Amino acid sequence: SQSAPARLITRYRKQLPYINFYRFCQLLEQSQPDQPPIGSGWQARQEAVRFCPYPGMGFPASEIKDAVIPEESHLPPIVHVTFMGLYGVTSPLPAHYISDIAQQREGHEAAADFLDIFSHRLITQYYRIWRKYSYPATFEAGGQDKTSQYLLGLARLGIPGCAQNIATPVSRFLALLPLMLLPGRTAEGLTSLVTLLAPGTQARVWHHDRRRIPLKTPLTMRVHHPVSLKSRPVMGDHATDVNGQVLLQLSTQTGSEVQGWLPGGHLYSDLLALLHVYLGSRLDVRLQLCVERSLLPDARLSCRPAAGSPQLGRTAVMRTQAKIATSAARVMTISLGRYQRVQEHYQRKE
Amino acid sequence: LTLRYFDAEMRYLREAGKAFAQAHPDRAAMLDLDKAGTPDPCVERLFEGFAFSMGRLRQKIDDDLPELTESLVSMLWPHYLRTIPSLSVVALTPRLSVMKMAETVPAGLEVTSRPVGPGNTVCRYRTTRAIPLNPLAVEKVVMTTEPDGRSVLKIGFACSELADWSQVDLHRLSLYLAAEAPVSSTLHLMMTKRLAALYLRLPGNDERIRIDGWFSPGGFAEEDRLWPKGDSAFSGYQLLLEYFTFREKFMFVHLNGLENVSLPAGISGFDLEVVLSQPWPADLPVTDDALCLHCVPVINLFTLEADPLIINGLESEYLLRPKRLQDGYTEIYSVDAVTGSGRTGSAEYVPFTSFRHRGGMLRHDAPERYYHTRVKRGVTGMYDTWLILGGQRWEADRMPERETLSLRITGTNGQLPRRALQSTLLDRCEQVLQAPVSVRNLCKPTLPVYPPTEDRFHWRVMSHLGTGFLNMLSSAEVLRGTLALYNWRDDELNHRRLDAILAVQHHRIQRFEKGFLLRGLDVEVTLDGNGFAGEGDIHLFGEMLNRFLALYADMNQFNQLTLIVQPEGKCIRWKENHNPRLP
Amino acid sequence: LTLRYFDAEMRYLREAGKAFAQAHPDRAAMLDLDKAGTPDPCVERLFEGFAFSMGRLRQKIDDDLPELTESLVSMLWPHYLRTIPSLSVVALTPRLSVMKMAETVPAGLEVTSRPVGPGNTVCRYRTTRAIPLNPLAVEKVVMTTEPDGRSVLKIGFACSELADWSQVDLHRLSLYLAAEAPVSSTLHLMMTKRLAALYLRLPGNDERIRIDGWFSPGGFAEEDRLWPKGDSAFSGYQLLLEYFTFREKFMFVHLNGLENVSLPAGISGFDLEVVLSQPWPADLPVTDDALCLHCVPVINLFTLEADPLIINGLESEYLLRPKRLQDGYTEIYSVDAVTGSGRTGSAEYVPFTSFRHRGGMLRHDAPERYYHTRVKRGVTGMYDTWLILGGQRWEADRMPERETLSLRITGTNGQLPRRALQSTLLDRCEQVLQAPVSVRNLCKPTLPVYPPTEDRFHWRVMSHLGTGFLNMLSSAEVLRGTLALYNWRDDELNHRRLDAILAVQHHRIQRFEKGFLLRGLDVEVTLDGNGFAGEGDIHLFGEMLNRFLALYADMNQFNQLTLIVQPEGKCIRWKENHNPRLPG
Amino acid sequence: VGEEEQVILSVLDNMQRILNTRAGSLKHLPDYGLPDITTILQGMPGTAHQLMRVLSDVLLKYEPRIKRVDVTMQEQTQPGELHYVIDAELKDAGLVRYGTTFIPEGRVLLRHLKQQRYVQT
């Protein structure tokens, strides 16, 4: 752009004798990042790019102290550091091209532009290795889940192609990466799942609960004569299934976080980070908070009725101090059903 | 392509110079060259070629970055798949003077001594697990409808009056469906009609043959894109993939002991009445080329063992041998596998085990004379590979005095298309072929085929795949993947096959003695590409054994597939797939 | 050097001569190399050797980053490019005259140190670790042999406020001792087999407590050898031996009894405490190797300090050495905390792993923050010298020489002579500590553990650990999937301890108290192998106590641990009170 | 013979550069150049023969454009002091497409270059 020398070399022209080129060419792409002249498409179309006046220097890395940018011939790069910069330069010129320049004379000053056509395109990709291609520590590449670094060093957890149904898009690996890797596990990681997403919030997990109904279609409290069997089922009409509906409580103190844990705030964040990320169909997670006396509205109109079920919070009209309580429930993170029906056909005779 | 990145730079240099010799100050001298005109071999050949190497190699590496840690599918090992030979078709075999005989045919029959080509040679190649045969072949295969209108088939009255069938034991005599399955409902119906068989009634009037033990028919192995789907469903293949056609499970086809209520002169009946309740379409014709007796597959696997010209120095020898550097083998022939060597100095120096055998930490707990194989690619223009390989502790001892190291080297050959082979029998077994054997070469062979390495996605997308990670999947996640990754002969027929799929969702099964967090899923779709109820069961059948495998890292996982046949249909298959414990 | 440089050139010469020329007949229909011949000028000779000399250095830079990105991305799951400091157990003794409400306030401490090498001295990290009380006394105990193999201690002291000071913290004084290798582990093995302690009272000085309402057990292990692997199955935010060490987290058998002493009156404490079930084996010396108060072993941590220096350009690399690093401090630790005085934001710093997404996707009020370093060598005399690089859209444009910059960093010291010394000088821990103390360097300081994983082929297995699934099937896994973390020290003792035979998997159902079906599994590990270690009875006990805590592998599992020896007489089970609230 | 002049000029420049580069001098290519030790100049070993071969070899390796080649050395003992010049006469043919020389017929043009060798003090 016109703006890139106009931002860099016209304003901040005091560090050019002591500038790092790796720093410099980074700040070039940060200078025009929106539709950048993307350096990967260099393999056909350096025409209409207008890159920096680096070539002709013969420099090693971060040696760029010379800095001359014209404005007129529709291209910045016109640099020939003469008698220095012998970057691989070994021998004199051959016979026919000296006769083309006649005779290694001041016409070489208009010939080095052609002659440096290779060293133009080489130090491009030499930089491209160092900063974007295979170095970047996932810290220079530093993208917004776009970089091939992220897609390589993230897919080992096992999310390629699965961009379906992820509302807050896949970026919160950054804590969960070792913890999502040990298989069939665990209990501890859910506390980290809280600690990332909101500070100051403390929690404990109880391993089992008295889960109830599931209502069964044969009632069987009348005996059979023809087919009456015993072994396991001792019950009446409702059953309790303990077996994997683990239970969580939370501990905050700041009403911002408390109204950050309203239905509306950050409650939907954990609801996403479970049901497609870490648990899926293993379990069901029951939620609860225990806080102080009341932070409560009134019974008015259309849509904020439910803190789940419970509603209180105007009976305190009198007392000057308070007490703690438990807050409410939030439902299991579930995914279930029956689809409808019964079938017609069969598998195989072997 | 190698020519692709070549063609990038061939554009690039000219588009550089057209901006230069126009107005830019190298037109002080080279405008005098291009007005006079310089498409020179002096300048334009060599200098473009000089830029072309760097526009090839560094460009091609940095475009893709084929990192080293992508070589760990090696320790997962299905990955011998990356060079699949030509599917030589099922071969055929006639009678040989049927009189009191029972054939006994070992495998390893080299065939096709005839088909040399223009720049092509004769290809010798092997069979896989040849079968003792029994001399009889009925020659009329006729659809016949009943007075009650039910299309039935023909009797076994071929060679019963000539041979000692009391001496010949008839159990499980297979037959792969012949060239009427090109009507691509023939193998569909005729197999799925045998999902609904009834018994048999034959008139022969020859008190010779009273057996049981009805066989597996077949004819799946025509296909080879449905086939790798059934391949990785038995991770457990680790030795059986080494000739790689695995005819041990036979692609399950059963009919049980089918009882001949055999009848006297004139009376008969070979019913399959349950599917035969719906007999053939009028556009399903009959043809006397459902002739299927001795259909045995061969693959394009050639053999040799080159000269031990080894070793001096270090591991960098990679076996360019004059049997392969023989010219007709130079041009096309390559190497598939390298087995069984390391017999120099003593009888046991560095056997070919330790390249794969070690799979963990106690490397210092390892005795000496051990091994590793590394690999490469080869020549630009072909799929060639080269194998720098060496020892583990004796090269750390540095004595190149080990010479008589053996070689067991298998390989195959490339070609050019528009081939059509020349079928002959090359070799005959001793004292068994009373008369010789003709070869019919039932269909056309396929090509060599190679996996997609052309994508960091489509390379690492399998590196995920083989896990217990299926926790939520939908129909976008399946049709996109990785069913495409098992499809390397990628046809528009195949494109019509995969793209049927529409809707996938999960629900949760809860029958119990005790709790049983269980589940089971549902998908089946449109009636066109994989639309025959034969192939609607067959391509289904390759899928189910995949779907059973990835089941659980915890016992709360449980799969059963119901499947909605057409937009108007219904089907379930499975039985509940209770894996034994898999943490 | 120049050989593989020249090897690159001569590879490329033959490549571009024949493999890149003659293998393209369709582009031999567009470019010829051979039949055109050489040009007249010296124009081929320069440009082949120029273009290929460029690919030389490009080859060489390509031969760098597989040693770098592989070294870095494999630091994200595991955290094992570190080192370990040295350590040895601390013992302290206050003045007995100052016992009058001698409640230990273990907040701010020191270590004691020693001149070493070129006059170098030590500053180990102190413990701030909790000690509730100093004791009354430990006495010169005698393992008093009895009709049932019993062998008693003796403790007791009275100059103080023991109706009120013991009223503070007798209660869960989960307070141990330590001893030697065949010796203490034997007493662990009896801690699972203690009888009623029928005569339960300390002798000598119960004039002033007069009340025994509280019961206080003990328990301890050698916290150097095994405990890294138990301190290796956890999350990604904890210090190596600064989390696990000072945290009361360990699996210690603090078996606590309740029995009233039966004694003659006038005996201020009866001298049996030690009722047991087993014959105490002989060929074992008896002594007072039983210390009441002695704090945990602790390591080197300095608190390194320097000047914040802000230059635009310094952010790319700067690789600073602080002041006293140059004064002979041979090592630092990684970067602890960065702050400073900025302009818009006064100070904003977030570590790069825990980045809370301005550049990610949470996008609310947690700004652009970089904090990231390497440890990359190039060092004249060591193998690590590097300082950070972190830089994004902050204000280095208008303030190139000013930013929020103020740091925190600790350190250690590596290049040191092999001297096993006493922690003698700098006894000035005692400054909070209204009573002065005594200082006992109790055991040998170790060596700093920095031979990590050395060659690359092992990090392949370290990456295999994920997809190659859990080492809990067939015991080829538990052979292999056992870390070489023990092999970092390379005790051949431990190398013989890895003689593990086939684990056999089962499952079951346990009925609960309140009558519910609960899932159980059943591993069946077989030891098989005698001359496992010194004592099977010692080692398998102290070894199962390790290995069962490393059995966190699901959430709704009642555990399973049944150790089966070779059929040499017995089979040892393990189970705990795994409850809807808490595991046992 | 403008093309011939261009080829002779090209060869002269190339020859001068190679002569200047002493054989060992160029680090990148130790092979490049001609061995022309001062000692050879000081005194005559029958140097003409060996020098001719050395030159021929370098030319063959270094300049592929030349086809027909003939090198003759005339040693002038008469020169003394920093002198004792060697006359190098190079007869040449151009392989190049024009190839205007004796063996490449092209136009028949035997190009030649004459140089004198000196010693470094």
Short mmCIF file of N, CA, C and O in Angstrom, two decimals, chain C residues 2 6 9 36-46 53 56, chain D residues 7 11 14 28 58-66 94-96:
data_model
loop_
_atom_site.label_atom_id
_atom_site.label_comp_id
_atom_site.label_asym_id
_atom_site.label_seq_id
_atom_site.Cartn_x
_atom_site.Cartn_y
_atom_site.Cartn_z
N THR C 2 30.46 -28.03 5.57
CA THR C 2 30.60 -27.86 4.13
C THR C 2 30.50 -29.15 3.35
O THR C 2 30.41 -29.10 2.12
N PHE C 6 28.13 -29.36 0.30
CA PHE C 6 28.57 -29.91 -0.97
C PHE C 6 27.77 -31.13 -1.36
O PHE C 6 27.55 -31.35 -2.56
N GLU C 9 24.76 -29.72 -2.96
CA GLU C 9 25.05 -29.23 -4.30
C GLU C 9 25.20 -30.36 -5.30
O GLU C 9 24.72 -30.28 -6.43
N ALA C 36 21.29 -29.41 -26.52
CA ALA C 36 21.70 -28.04 -26.78
C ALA C 36 23.17 -27.80 -26.46
O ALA C 36 23.77 -26.87 -27.00
N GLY C 37 23.75 -28.62 -25.58
CA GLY C 37 25.15 -28.48 -25.23
C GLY C 37 25.39 -27.38 -24.23
O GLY C 37 24.45 -26.73 -23.77
N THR C 38 26.65 -27.18 -23.86
CA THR C 38 26.99 -26.09 -22.95
C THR C 38 26.92 -24.75 -23.68
O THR C 38 27.17 -24.68 -24.89
N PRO C 39 26.57 -23.68 -22.98
CA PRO C 39 26.71 -22.35 -23.57
C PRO C 39 28.17 -21.99 -23.72
O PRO C 39 29.05 -22.54 -23.05
N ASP C 40 28.42 -21.06 -24.64
CA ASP C 40 29.75 -20.46 -24.74
C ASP C 40 30.20 -19.73 -23.47
O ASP C 40 31.33 -19.99 -23.02
N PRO C 41 29.41 -18.85 -22.83
CA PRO C 41 29.96 -18.11 -21.68
C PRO C 41 30.07 -19.00 -20.45
O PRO C 41 29.56 -20.12 -20.39
N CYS C 42 30.73 -18.45 -19.43
CA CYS C 42 30.76 -19.04 -18.10
C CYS C 42 29.49 -18.60 -17.36
O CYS C 42 29.50 -17.87 -16.37
N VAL C 43 28.36 -19.06 -17.89
CA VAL C 43 27.06 -18.66 -17.40
C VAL C 43 26.31 -19.81 -16.77
O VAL C 43 25.56 -19.60 -15.80
N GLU C 44 26.54 -21.04 -17.22
CA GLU C 44 26.05 -22.21 -16.52
C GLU C 44 26.75 -22.39 -15.18
O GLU C 44 26.09 -22.70 -14.18
N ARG C 45 28.06 -22.15 -15.16
CA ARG C 45 28.89 -22.45 -14.00
C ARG C 45 28.56 -21.59 -12.80
O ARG C 45 28.70 -22.05 -11.67
N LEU C 46 28.14 -20.35 -13.03
CA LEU C 46 27.81 -19.50 -11.90
C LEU C 46 26.45 -19.86 -11.32
O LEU C 46 26.29 -19.96 -10.10
N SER C 53 23.41 -23.29 -4.05
CA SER C 53 23.94 -22.83 -2.77
C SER C 53 22.87 -22.14 -1.96
O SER C 53 22.94 -22.11 -0.73
N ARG C 56 21.06 -24.96 -0.40
CA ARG C 56 21.88 -25.45 0.70
C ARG C 56 21.42 -24.89 2.03
O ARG C 56 21.04 -25.64 2.94
N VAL D 7 31.64 -13.54 -29.02
CA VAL D 7 32.12 -14.75 -28.37
C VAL D 7 33.56 -14.61 -27.87
O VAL D 7 33.86 -15.02 -26.76
N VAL D 11 34.78 -14.95 -24.00
CA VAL D 11 35.80 -15.87 -23.55
C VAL D 11 36.93 -15.14 -22.87
O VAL D 11 37.43 -15.59 -21.88
N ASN D 14 35.90 -14.31 -19.37
CA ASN D 14 35.84 -15.50 -18.55
C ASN D 14 37.23 -15.98 -18.19
O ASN D 14 37.51 -16.33 -17.04
N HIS D 28 34.13 -21.27 -2.30
CA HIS D 28 32.97 -22.02 -2.68
C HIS D 28 33.40 -23.12 -3.59
O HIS D 28 33.03 -24.28 -3.38
N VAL D 58 40.82 -26.74 -17.08
CA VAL D 58 39.95 -25.79 -16.43
C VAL D 58 38.93 -25.29 -17.40
O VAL D 58 37.76 -25.15 -17.04
N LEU D 59 39.33 -25.03 -18.65
CA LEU D 59 38.41 -24.54 -19.64
C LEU D 59 37.34 -25.55 -19.88
O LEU D 59 36.16 -25.21 -19.97
N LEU D 60 37.71 -26.83 -19.98
CA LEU D 60 36.72 -27.82 -20.29
C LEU D 60 35.72 -27.84 -19.19
O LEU D 60 34.51 -27.89 -19.43
N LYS D 61 36.18 -27.81 -17.93
CA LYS D 61 35.27 -27.89 -16.83
C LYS D 61 34.42 -26.65 -16.74
O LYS D 61 33.20 -26.73 -16.60
N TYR D 62 35.06 -25.47 -16.78
CA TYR D 62 34.46 -24.19 -16.57
C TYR D 62 33.68 -23.59 -17.71
O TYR D 62 32.73 -22.86 -17.46
N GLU D 63 34.08 -23.79 -18.99
CA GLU D 63 33.30 -23.15 -20.02
C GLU D 63 32.87 -24.16 -21.05
O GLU D 63 33.63 -24.53 -21.94
N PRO D 64 31.65 -24.60 -20.94
CA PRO D 64 31.08 -25.58 -21.83
C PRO D 64 30.78 -25.07 -23.20
O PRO D 64 30.59 -25.88 -24.11
N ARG D 65 30.70 -23.74 -23.38
CA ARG D 65 30.34 -23.15 -24.64
C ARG D 65 31.41 -23.41 -25.66
O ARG D 65 31.12 -23.47 -26.85
N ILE D 66 32.67 -23.53 -25.23
CA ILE D 66 33.75 -23.72 -26.15
C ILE D 66 33.72 -25.11 -26.68
O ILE D 66 33.50 -26.07 -25.93
N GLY D 94 33.10 -22.31 -30.91
CA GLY D 94 31.95 -22.10 -30.08
C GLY D 94 30.94 -23.16 -30.40
O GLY D 94 30.57 -23.35 -31.56
N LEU D 95 30.51 -23.88 -29.36
CA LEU D 95 29.54 -24.95 -29.35
C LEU D 95 28.18 -24.37 -29.56
O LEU D 95 27.30 -25.03 -30.11
N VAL D 96 28.00 -23.12 -29.09
CA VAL D 96 26.77 -22.38 -29.06
C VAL D 96 26.04 -22.54 -30.36
O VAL D 96 26.60 -22.97 -31.36
#
